[PDB]
C-alpha cells in the first residue's frame, strides 16, 4: 500500500478516519497482512519476542536504578520494620508548597512509597548496599542491548531461521525443560547457597570473594563422598537474628518446614533445597524426546497410540499433533491458560507461605501484590479462551480431526453449554437467595433466623494438614495417624507449629461467612466460562448463522433480519466475558481484603458476623474503610493520600464514560457528525482549513472495544486507590 | 550535577518528546507514498 496501513490495501484505500484507527489495531495480526508467507510470519514473530524481552529487562533495570539513586534501601536494611520503602522521587511543576511538604514527610524530598515488595525480595536474595543495586541495573541495560542486536541479526538474510527449525518440537521442549527451567534452578540454588544464606548470617560474599569463601565449612567433600547429610546439620537456631551471626547455623540444605521465627518467612535453606530438587526433576524430564541422537520419544506416535479400547473417546488423540504444530493460536491459548493458573497460584501461595522477610508485616504491599496477580490471571485466562476460538474459526481442519477427541467436543456442544448453564443458574439462585434471606431477617431484627452453613469440607482439609481448632481428629491432626508418625521426625514439627499459630496466614480460620463467598466465586467462574466456551464452540456456526466461519472471528453483525443478529460474532463473547471476569475477580479481591483488614485490625469478628448479609459488605467494608481515602484532600487541607484520592475519582469518570460507548450506538453519532461537517464547510475563515481524511463515526466493533477499555481502566484504577489508601491510611 | 537532571529531563520527556512524536505520526499517516 501507499498509505498508513502498508499491510492492508483495503484500509489504505479508505477515504475516512477509519484508515488510521484500524491500521493501529490490526498492526500485530501479522497472519492477516497482505502477502504474508508462513516463513516470514515465524521469523518476524521471533524477532518481536526479542524486543519484548528487552523491554522487560529495561523495566527491571529502571526499578533498581531509581531505588538506588533516589531510595532508602540501606536505611530500610538497617531498620526494616520502622522505615517506609521509597520508589522514586517526584518533580511535578504543578505542585503547591503544601504538597511538597506532605509528600516529603519522613524524608527531605517529595517521594513515592513503593508497594511492590522489591525491598523485601532484594533483602532476602542478598542485596545490602545501593552500589550493588546499581551494578545490577547496568548489567541489565547491557543485556537489553544484546537482545535488540539479536532481533536484528535473525532478521538478516543469512541468519533467518528456517520454518523447519521453528517446528522442531522435541529439541525445543528438551532444551527448554532441561536448560531453561532445570539448569536455571540449579544456578539459583547456587546463588542462594553462595550469596543469600551467607548474608542472612552476617557474612558478605560478593564478586570480590566468592571464589575464596567456601559456602560450607566441610567443602564439596561431603557431596562427592555421598555423605550429603552433613549439609543439613546445624540449622539456624530459633533465636537467630536475621542479617546477623547471633544464633546462626552452618546448614545449607534442609527440610525444616515452617517459618523463620524472627522474619516470619520461609527458611532460606529450605528454599535452596527446594530448587535443587526441582532442578533434578526437570533436567531428567528434559531427556524424553528424540533429538538427533537416536534415543527418545516421538510425540506424534505417543498421541496417536492413545485411544481408549472401549471407544468411549472415539478415535482418541490422532490428528492433534498436526493441528497443534500448524496452529499458533492453539499454542498461545494453551500457554496463556497454564500461565493464568500459575499466576493465581502465585497469589494464593505467596500470602500463606510468605517467601520474603518482613513482607507479612507490610500490609499494604501484601494487599497490592495479591490483587495485582489475580487481575493479571483473569486477563490471561480470558485470552486463552479467546485464542482458542480464533483457532476454531481460522486453523481448525474438520477432516484431519475426524472423530478426534477435539471434534467430538464440538459434537456434544449443546450438552456442555446447557449443563454449564444449569450450574450457573443453580449457583446463582441459591447464593443470592440465601444472602437476601439473611439480609431480610437481620433487617427485621431477627438475626437468629439466618441460614448459615458451616464450611465443613474445607475445615476438614485444614484439619487433615494439622489444624486443631475444628476438633476433627483426622490425619495430621491425629497423633495416632500413620501419616503423623511418618513426618513427625522430618518436617511436621515446624509445620504443625505454623499451621496452629493464629498469627499466620497459613490456612486461615474459616466460618459460615466464607461458605457463601466461595459459592459466589464459583458462580463467577462458571458464568464467565459459559460465555467463553459458548463463543468458542459456536464460532464456526450456529442455527442463526450457519455460515459464521466465512465471516471471521470479529464482524459487526449479520443484519436486522432473521430476528436481529447483534453481538453474534465470537469476538463479542470475549467482549461480554470481560465484564464477568472483572466482576468475579472483584469479588475474590474484596473477600481477601476485608478478611485480612479485620484480622489486621484485631477484630476478626466483624467479618465473621457481617459477611453473612450484603449490607455488611457495603457498610462495614466499603463505607467504613473509605474514610481515609475520601479525606485525602478536604476544605481544610491535604495529605500524602491526595494522589490516591484524586485517582479514585478519576477512575469513576473513566468507568462512566465507557457507558456512553456501550449504550449509545453508531447511527445517532453519524448523523450528528454530518451536521458538524456542514458547519465547518460553511463557516468563513475556518473554511480555509480542511481535512484530508473524511470525518466519520466510530465503527460498531470499535465502539465496543473503546467502551470495554474505558470500563476496565476505570475499574482497576478505582480499586487500586481504595486498596492502597484504605490499608495505608489505617495501618500505616 | 546529577541532581539537576530531574528538572532538565522531565520537561523534555513530557512535553518536547510527545509533541515531536505526534507530529511525525501525523506526517506519516497523511503522506501518500
Amino acid at each position: 500500500a501507499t498509505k498508513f496501513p502498508k499491510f492492508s490495501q483495503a484500509l489504505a484505500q479508505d477515504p475516512a478516519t477509519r484508515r488510521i484507527w484500524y491500521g493501529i489495531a490490526t498492526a500485530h495480526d501479522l497472519e492477516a497482512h497482505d502477502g504474508m508467507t508462513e516463513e516470514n510470519l515465524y521469523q518476524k514473530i521471533f524477532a518481536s519476542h526479542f524486543g519484548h524481552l528487552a523491554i522487560i529487562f529495561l523495566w527491571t533495570s529502571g526499578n533498581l536504578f531509581h531505588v538506588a539513586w533516589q531510595g532508602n534501601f540501606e536505611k530500610w536494611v538497617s531498620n526494616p520494620l520502622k522505615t517506609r520503602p521509597i520508589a522514586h522521587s517526584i518533580w511535578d511543576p504543578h505542585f503547591g508548597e503544601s504538597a511538597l511538604k506532605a509528600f516529603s514527610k519522613g524524608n527531605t524530598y517529595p517521594v513515592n512509597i513503593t508497594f511492590s515488595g522489591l525491598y523485601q525480595w532484594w533483602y532476602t536474595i542478598g542485596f545490602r548496599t545501593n552500589q550493588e543495586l546499581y551494578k545490577g541495573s547496568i548489567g541489565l541495560l547491557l543485556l537489553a542491548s544484546v537482545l535488540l542486536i539479536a532481533g536484528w541479526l535473525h532478521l538478516q538474510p543469512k541468519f533467518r531461521p528456517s520454518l523447519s527449525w521453528f517446528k522442531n518440537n522435541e529439541s525445543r521442549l528438551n532444551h527448554h525443560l532441561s536448560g531453561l527451567l532445570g539448569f536455571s534452578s540449579l544456578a539459583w540454588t547456587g546463588h542462594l547457597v553462595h550469596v543469600a544464606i551467607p548474608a542472612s548470617r552476617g557474612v558478605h560474599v560478593g564478586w570480590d570473594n566468592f571464589l575464596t569463601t567456601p559456602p560450607h565449612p566441610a567443602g564439596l567433600t561431603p557431596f562427592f563422598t555421598g555423605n550429603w547429610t552433613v549439609y543439613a546439620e546445624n540449622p539456624d537456631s530459633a533465636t537467630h537474628v536475621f542479617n546477623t551471626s547471633e544464633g546462626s547455623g552452618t546448614a545449607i540444605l534442609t527440610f525444616l518446614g515452617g517459618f523463620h521465627p524472627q522474619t516470619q518467612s520461609l527458611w532460606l535453606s529450605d528454599m535452596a533445597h527446594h530448587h535443587l530438587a526441582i532442578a533434578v526433576v526437570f533436567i531428567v524430564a528434559g531427556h524424553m524426546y528424540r533429538t538427533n541422537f537416536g534415543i527418545g520419544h516421538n510425540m506424534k506416535e505417543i498421541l496417536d497410540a492413545h485411544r481408549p479400547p472401549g471407544g468411549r473417546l472415539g478415535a482418541g488423540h490422532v490428528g492433534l499433533f498436526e493441528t497443534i504444530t500448524n496452529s499458533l493460536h492453539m499454542q498461545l491459548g494453551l500457554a496463556l491458560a497454564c500461565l493464568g493458573v500459575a499466576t493465581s497460584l502465585t497469589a494464593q501461595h505467596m500470602y500463606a507461605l510468605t517467601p520474603y522477610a518482613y513482607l507479612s508485616k507490610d500490609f499494604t504491599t501484601e494487599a497490592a501484590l495479591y490483587t495485582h496477580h489475580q487481575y493479571i490471571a483473569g486477563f490471561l485466562m480470558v485470552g486463552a479462551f479467546a485464542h482458542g476460538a480464533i483457532f476454531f474459526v481460522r486453523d481448525y481442519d474438520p477432516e484431519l480431526n475426524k472423530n478426534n477427541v477435539l471434534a467430538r467436543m464440538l459434537e456434544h456442544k449443546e450438552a456442555i453449554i446447557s449443563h454449564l448453564s444449569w450450574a450457573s443458574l443453580f449457583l446463582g439462585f441459591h447464593t443470592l437467595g440465601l444472602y437476601i434471606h439473611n439480609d431480610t431477617v437481620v433487617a427485621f431484627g431477627q438475626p437468629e433466623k439466618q441460614i448459615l452453613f458451616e464450611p465443613l469440607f474445607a475445615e476438614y482439609i485444614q484439619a487433615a494438614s494439622g489444624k486443631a481448632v475444628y476438633q476433627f481428629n483426622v490425619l495430621l491432626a491425629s497423633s495416632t495417624s500413620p501419616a503423623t508418625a511418618a513426618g513427625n521426625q522430618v518436617w511436621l514439627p515446624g509445620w504443625l507449629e505454623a499451621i496452629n499459630n493464629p498469627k499466620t496466614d497459613l490456612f486461615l480460620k474459616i466460618g459460615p461467612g466464607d461458605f457463601l463467598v466461595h459459592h459466589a466465586i464459583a458462580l463467577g467462574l462458571h458464568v464467565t466460562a459459559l460465555i467463553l466456551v459458548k463463543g468458542a464452540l459456536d464460532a464456526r456456526g450456529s442455527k442463526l448463522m450457519p455460515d459464521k466461519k466465512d465471516f471471521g472471528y470479529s464482524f459487526p453483525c449479520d443484519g436486522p433480519g432473521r430476528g436481529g443478529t447483534c453481538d453474534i460474532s465470537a469476538w463479542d463473547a470475549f467482549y461480554l466475558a470481560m465484564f464477568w471476569m472483572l466482576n468475579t475477580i472483584g469479588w475474590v479481591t474484596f473477600y481477601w481484603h476485608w478478611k485480612h483488614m479485620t484480622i489486621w485490625g484485631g477484630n476478626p469478628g466483624q467479618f465473621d458476623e457481617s459477611s453473612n448479609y450484603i449490607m455488611g459488605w457495603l457498610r462495614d467494608y466499603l463505607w467504613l474503610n473509605s474514610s481515609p481515602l475520601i479525606n485525602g484532600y478536604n476544605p481544610f487541607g491535604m495529605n500524602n493520600l491526595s494522589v490516591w484520592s484524586w485517582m479514585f475519582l478519576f477512575g469513576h469518570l473513566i468507568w462512566a464514560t465507557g457507558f456512553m460507548f456501550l449504550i449509545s450506538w453508531r447511527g445517532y453519532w453519524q448523523e450528528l457528525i454530518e451536521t458538524l461537517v456542514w458547519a465547518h464547510e460553511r463557516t468563513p475563515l475556518a473554511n480555509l482549513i480542511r481535512w484530508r481524511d473524511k470525518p466519520v463515526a466510530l465503527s460498531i466493533v470499535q465502539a465496543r472495544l473503546v467502551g470495554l477499555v474505558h470500563f476496565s481502566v476505570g475499574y482497576i484504577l478505582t480499586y487500586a486507590a481504595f486498596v492502597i489508601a484504605s490499608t495505608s491510611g489505617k495501618f500505616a | 550535577a546529577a541532581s539537576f537532571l530531574p528538572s532538565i529531563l522531565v520537561p523534555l520527556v513530557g512535553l518536547i518528546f510527545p509533541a515531536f512524536s505526534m507530529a511525525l505520526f501525523f506526517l506519516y499517516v497523511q503522506t501518500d507514498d
Binding site: 524486543g51 545501593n130 532481533g151 536484528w152 | -
Partner: peptide
C-alpha cells in the same frame, strides 16, 4: 551513593539501547 559519573555512565548505556532499538523497529517494518 551513586556518583554523578555513575549516573552519566548509565545514561550513555541507555542511549546505545535507544539507537539499537530504532534499528530493530525499522528492520521489523
Amino acid at each position: 551513593m551513586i556518583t554523578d559519573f555513575q549516573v552519566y555512565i548509565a545514561l550513555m548505556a541507555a542511549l546505545l539501547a535507544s539507537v539499537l532499538a530504532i534499528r530493530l523497529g525499522a528492520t521489523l517494518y
